[PDB]
Subunit: 110 residues, 2 copies
Amino acid sequence: STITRPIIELSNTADKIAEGNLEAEVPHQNRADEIGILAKSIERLRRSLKQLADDGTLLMAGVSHDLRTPLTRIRLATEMMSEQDGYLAESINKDIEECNAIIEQFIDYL
Amino acid sequence: STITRPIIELSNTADKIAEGNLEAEVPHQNRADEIGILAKSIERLRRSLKQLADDGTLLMAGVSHDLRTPLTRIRLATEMMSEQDGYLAESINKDIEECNAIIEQFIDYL
């Protein structure tokens, strides 16, 4: 009833987005009827998918960036440790380096 | 029209999913007509969202489980520090807790 064609267009676009084309334009958002309402909802889904994707790609960089602060302060604390505790300072620093290697290496596992 | 009700129902479902209810049930998937085609498309979007959430969650679980080891080693080391270095043991333990909290925060986004 010229509801069929716009509905199939909207469904086709939804399929393409679900399959990975997160920048595809969702049609019919400016329809005045209920298909416009549905199209806006599909655009919300697209925006959520694109957010989760963009976040997944930045996840390791984010984790590394945020952990750097307390890890650096742990290193600072080791630098301040006494001679008696020298062996513990070295052990802890090796643990920090291990955290660094785990983080940097992580992406390699793939 | 005779398909207005299900169109709006599907839009409400899509909104709920986009807002983060990734387990929502998508109605009308087994229909042969326009409604069924749309419903299947919306289910595909839901599945893709859930998969990206699962992917991010898996990666953070991996980061948590790798970092647990060196962070535990640091914790054990602080227990061996001298009394004179107590202030540093306290600082380091606080910073391990910060590491744990950062990881928790990233687990939480998903």
